[PDB]
Amino acid sequence: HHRWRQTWSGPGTTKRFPETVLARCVKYTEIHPEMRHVDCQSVWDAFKGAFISKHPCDITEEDYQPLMKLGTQTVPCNKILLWSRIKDLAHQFTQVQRDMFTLEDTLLGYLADDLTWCGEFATSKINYQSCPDWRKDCSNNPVSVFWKTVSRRFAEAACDVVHVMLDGSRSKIFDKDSTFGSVEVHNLQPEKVQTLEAWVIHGGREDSRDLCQDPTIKELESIISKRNIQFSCKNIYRPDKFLQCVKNP
Amino acid sequence: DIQMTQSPSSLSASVGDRVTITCRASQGIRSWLAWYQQKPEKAPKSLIYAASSLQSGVPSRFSGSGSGTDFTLTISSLQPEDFATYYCQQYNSYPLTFGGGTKVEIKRTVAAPSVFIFPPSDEQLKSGTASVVCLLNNFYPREAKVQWKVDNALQSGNSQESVTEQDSKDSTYSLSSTLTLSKADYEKHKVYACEVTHQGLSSPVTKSFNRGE
Amino acid sequence: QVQLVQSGAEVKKPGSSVKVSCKAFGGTFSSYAISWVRQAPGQGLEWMGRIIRFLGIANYAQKFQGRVTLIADKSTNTAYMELSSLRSEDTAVYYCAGEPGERDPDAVDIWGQGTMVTVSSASTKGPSVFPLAPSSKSTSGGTAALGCLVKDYFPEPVTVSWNSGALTSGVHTFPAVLQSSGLYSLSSVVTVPSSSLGTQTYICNVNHKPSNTKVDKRVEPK
Q: B182-198: buried (b, 16+ CB within 10 Å) or exposed (e) per residue?
């Protein structure tokens, strides 16, 4: 239904995308002995097969099913850090706390982190010139559909206390139309998950106020309360101090 | 520590029976409880994780239930390969703790022991020790008491016993008890008696011999 | 088809150390962590500790902290449990086991075959084998009980057969008892037709591999 077009608003496929995905797969399987059964060439073939020779506004979650089977990974359900609009500090945290996982510390998340990719209708060519922007061109693009599909499975995997980092400086601390807000929160399984604990990260403001009563936090509390999951909210006033303190536990 | 209590300690059952055994935690463990099966002289086998989830290849007749403190393992129709010891384990928090186990054994009719007594051999008496052996052969149930008596004086601290695993063919147990004295102490006394108490005997039976007769 | 394979049985003096190996064979080994569990003779299961394979960080039960080291080197396919300052009460079968990683920690889905570790001051010794002769005091009507007493050996195990394995029906080979001496004692008995005792030869065959001791004992009435 999307209009045929050859130029997009977004950045092109990242330079050396095929080589980068293969190298990242090799590196991840070296770090994680429990994933050395993975054939990284086969993973790349499944990844390429998801988006090559398709109009990059007509991508479906089913297109990624071969990649999702090969990238199947058991991740410790009680050691998950979700995040929304604060990837920088979330990744700093799991670099310190190496027994904790964000989505981008899993094989598939690690492969795709900070990369862009798309193909072209009626050719076998990866488009290095431009790729669809989610806002300016179309929602159902290779990158957006990939992150939706892996994020749902990651959220489904969570148990016990799930932590989520949020940016307290933003106009919407919790945005319901974010990936966290529209996919991840709605796939936290009741009973399996005991509690969602929000960590609200503060910015530079001098008039530092309790952000855990913000209407968007009440919105998040309401969503997870209706899933029969307990809600907790923590103000993180000094994220620099938090990241130094986090080393102990 | 989280103390895991399994009940009953032993269960007598028949092929085709519905069998339910329980596991209780001293604190909340959510659904983080595992079940394991173990047979004599063999490694454990994993059955259940997360209270209700079957490990790959585990027959559908196995099921698990429980959240918080109280847990259940149910075998819907007991098969011959299911007679075994079952262990629960909490993995909620450290240390990881096991229940004391539930033995699922084969029910059969009460059978009194055949009681046999063996004086020491002449070859052993030359070496300066006397081992007197009392055999309780093919009895059920497993619960039995042996008391050694030497000239009607009750012995203590000078005997050891062991019991076979439940027999495959007839579902009975056997027990061997050895009284050990010096040759000097053996040659002082005359009447060596093995007194046996068991459900299949209406009163306790004594098997005895006179030394050198 | 994946299995965990451990090193063979160990016999150790008090104060020594034992290192037990645990290697995956025969398929995908995707365990997030390796866990160690022990079982003292006739007792239940006791958790010792665990190590996360990708991090090499270990959790230990308090009673094993400072006594146990777990290794799972990322550049080789073998895990190890080293237990030091061994005491007689460390006599047990030691199991390695794999956690899939659905949680940290998780249930184990795979077990090694186990490693028997005997801790004792005792020295290797072959058994003395004494007859348990059939008599009126070991006969019930048409059936007679006879046997062999396999006394004062170390370490476990001993194998007992009757008539070189030809007599298995009605044989009860009892679990060994550990005597106050530190040496094991075992009895093996068999029930036979009373009317056979004059004619049929009954011999117990005792093999103690650690001492290279083989004894054949003819059991006949007095």
A: eeeebeeeeebbbbbeb
Resolved by: X-ray
Phi, psi of A199 (to 5 degrees): -105, 105
Residue A109 token pair: 């998340």
Candidates A74, A100, A107, A162: best to mutate against C (most CBs of C within 10 A) is A74
**What is the spatial distance between Cα A164 and Cα A82, in angstroms, rounded to a whole number?**
4
The boundaries of the domain holding residue C70 are: 3-119
> A117-127 burial, b if ≥16 CB within 10 A, otherwise e?
bbbbeeeeebb
Exposure b/e, B155-174, CB count within 10 A at least 16 = b: eeeebeebbbebbeeebbbb
Instruction: Give how many domains chain B has, as a whole number.
Output: 2
Size of interface B-C (CB pairs under 8 A): 136
Q: Which of A33, A77, A160 lies at the smallest CB-CB distance from C54? A: A33
Rounded to 5 degrees, φ, ψ at B173 are -115, 155
> Where among C119, C150, C171 does a domain terminate?
C119
C-alpha C21/C-alpha C71 separation (Å) is: 9
Count CB neighbours of A148 within 10 A. 18
Starting at the edge strand found earlier in the chain, the sheet holding C202-208 runs C159-162, C202-208, C213-219
Q: What angle do CA B22, B25, B28 make, to 5 degrees?
A: 125
Q: Please list, in sequence order, all residues whose beta carbon lies within 8 angstroms of the beta carbon of residue C63, skipping any fewer than 6 positions away.
A: none
- CA separation for the pair B46, C111 (Å, rounded): 8
Give resolution in angstroms: 1.9
Residue B181 forms contact with C (CB below 8 Å): no
Per the CB < 8 A criterion, the answer to whether B84 and B38 are in contact is yes
CB B212 within 8 A of CB B158: no
Helical (H) or strand (E) element with C4: strand C3-6
Rounded Cα distance, B17 and B9, in Å:
18
Contacts of A194 in chain B (CB under 8 A): 30
Instruction: Name which of B48, B91, B132 to mutate to probe chain C: the one with the most chain C Cβ atoms within 10 A of its Cβ.
Output: B91
| Active-site position among A40, A77, A118, A233 | A77
Of the three residues C60, C95, C119, the one that is the final residue of a domain is: C119
Q: Are C61 and C111 contained in the same domain?
A: yes
Residues B86 and B129 in one domain: no
Name the residue in chain C with its Cα closest to that of B166.
Answer: C172
Distance of CA A224 to the CA centre of its chain: 19
Q: Which amino acid is at B69?
A: T
C35, C137, C185 member nearest B116 (Cβ): C137
Same domain, C106 and C142: no
> Whole-angstrom Cα distance, residue A174 to residue A217?
6
Is B200:B113 a contact under the CB 8 Å cutoff? yes
Give yes or no for a contact between B49 and C109, defined as CB atoms under 8 angstroms apart.
yes
**Residue A146 and residue A63: Cα distance in Å, rounded?**
9
Query: CA distances (Å), C176 to each of A217, B178, B194, C157, in order?
Result: 67, 11, 20, 9
Residue B5: its H or E element: strand B4-7
CA gap C10, C126 in Å, rounded = 18
Helix, strand, coil content of chain C in percent (nearest 5): 10, 50, 40
Q: CA nearest A110: which of A91, A132, A86? A: A91
- What crossing angle do the helices spanning A17-31 and A40-51 adopt, rounded to 10°? 140
